[PDB]
Amino acid sequence: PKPVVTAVSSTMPVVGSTVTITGQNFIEVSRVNINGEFDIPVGDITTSNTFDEISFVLPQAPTQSGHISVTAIGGTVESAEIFYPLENVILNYDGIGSHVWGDCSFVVADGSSAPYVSNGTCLGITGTVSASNYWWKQSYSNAQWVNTSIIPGNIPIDDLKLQFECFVKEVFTGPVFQIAMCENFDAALNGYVPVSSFTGKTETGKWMQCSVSLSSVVADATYQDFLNRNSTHIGVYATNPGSSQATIEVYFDNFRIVRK
Ligand code: NA
Ligand code: NA
């Protein structure tokens, strides 16, 4: 019985954070290879009772994109998603894209306070916001859109998704996020609360991958049409339409556009 991979917790997990892989027949896992660059020590791999899940801490960043390969007693299987799709990152605040203006913070995690680990600099939206507040903290940034050598111009927007890593300290009630691109606010995603692509829940106290259809923030038919808006704007805006004051602490990194 061959091993099978059904899902991976993130395509770009933060170094020092837990990677979880779900699937079947993870029996006597003898190797987990990351992007043909390094192996996870077998002793550092945790396997569930029913052999349907493995997890491990990512010890270092791959330098190139690739896939995860899992060897079990039944054979070897490769994850279908591209792992560490570095070429798909549009904004990381460390040389891909840049912050232009906004009330927000930028942090390099220090191992002692949230978000504890980071891949370099991340965006912070943190602090206390009054009830019914429609302009609070935000970042207006310039993205570096994915090259058409990676995503051809004729790919439908319907076939693409926006992914990013997010850390939420504690759940909150009231505050929401807007994500907008190319100053097309009519097409923006509004009222968004970060939820995990892996669990469907707002995970707290750890990084999660968040994913939305690119059509939820882009109105154009194809990727080329989107590029021809001739704007590198990407904006992340926090407000609080709730009836109570709230304090939140949310971090973002590695915005990326990938194929569904
Ligand atoms: Na970063
Ligand atoms: Na352009």
Swiss-Prot record:
Keywords: Carbohydrate metabolism, Cell outer membrane, Lipoprotein, Membrane, Palmitate, Repeat, Signal. GO terms for molecular function: polysaccharide binding. It is a lipid-anchor. Pathway: Glucan metabolism; xyloglucan degradation. One of its GO terms (biological process) is symbiotic process benefiting host. It comes from the Bacteria. Residues 3-75 form the IPT/TIG domain. Polysaccharide-binding protein present at the surface of the cell. Probably mediates xyloglucan-binding before xyloglucan transport in the periplasm for degradation. This is IPT/TIG domain-containing protein BACOVA_02650. It comes from Bacteroides ovatus (strain ATCC 8483 / DSM 1896 / JCM 5824 / BCRC 10623 / CCUG 4943 / NCTC 11153). The chain holds residues 230 to 489 of 489 of the full protein.
